[PDB]
């Protein structure tokens, strides 16, 4: 048997949150702020992907480039192995060559 | 486990309601019921 026998607790959502009400504000800041700031500079997150989309292999390569010197030892070993595997997969395997 | 299947029971029942009058394990077990219902249809 897989279904729950009861209804899950009703999940209320505050649509007029501070965050939800202020979402999108100060976008278009370059367009109507004399281009002093780019909207890509409003992005918060990892240092290796701010204003950058990239592939998965591209993301791994960029992370090892930008922040791979102050990474943990096991994490960096994992990143190196992932880059190796991804290189092999994206360069030797699949349809469409 | 992002978005696994929740309503599998209703699909199982969709197949099984056409097997209730069968005989054996194929009136309750989906793996055999589905084959026998396909043949019946």
């Amino acid at each position: 048997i897989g279904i729950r026998l009861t209804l899950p607790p009703p999940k209320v959502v505050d649509r007029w949150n501070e965050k939800r009400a202020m979402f999108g504000v100060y976008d278009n800041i370059g367009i109507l702020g004399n281009f002093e700031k780019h909207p890509k500079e409003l992005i918060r997150g990892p240092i290796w992907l701010r204003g950058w989309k990239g592939n998965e292999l591209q993301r791994c390569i960029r992370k090892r480039k930008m922040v791979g010197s102050r990474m943990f030892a096991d994490d960096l070993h994992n990143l190196n192995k992932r880059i190796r595997y991804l290189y092999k997969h994206f360069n030797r395997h699949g349809k469409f060559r | 486990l992002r978005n696994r299947v929740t309503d599998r029971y209703f699909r199982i029942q969709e197949v099984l309601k056409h097997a209730r009058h069968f005989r054996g394990r194929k009136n309750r077990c989906y793996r055999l019921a589905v084959r026998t219902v396909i043949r019946a249809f």
């Binding site: 279904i3 729950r4 026998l5 009861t6 209804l7 899950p8 | 929740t6 309503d7 029971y9």
Partner: peptide, 26 residues
């Protein structure tokens, strides 16, 4: 548990229908 509400509501309706079938009111 599995996140969601539609399957739970559907199963609750099915259970209510089965209860009504088993114990029909006068």
């Amino acid at each position: 548990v599995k996140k969601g509400f539609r399957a739970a509501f559907r199963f609750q309706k099915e259970l209510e229908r089965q209860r009504l079938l088993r114990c029909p009111p006068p």
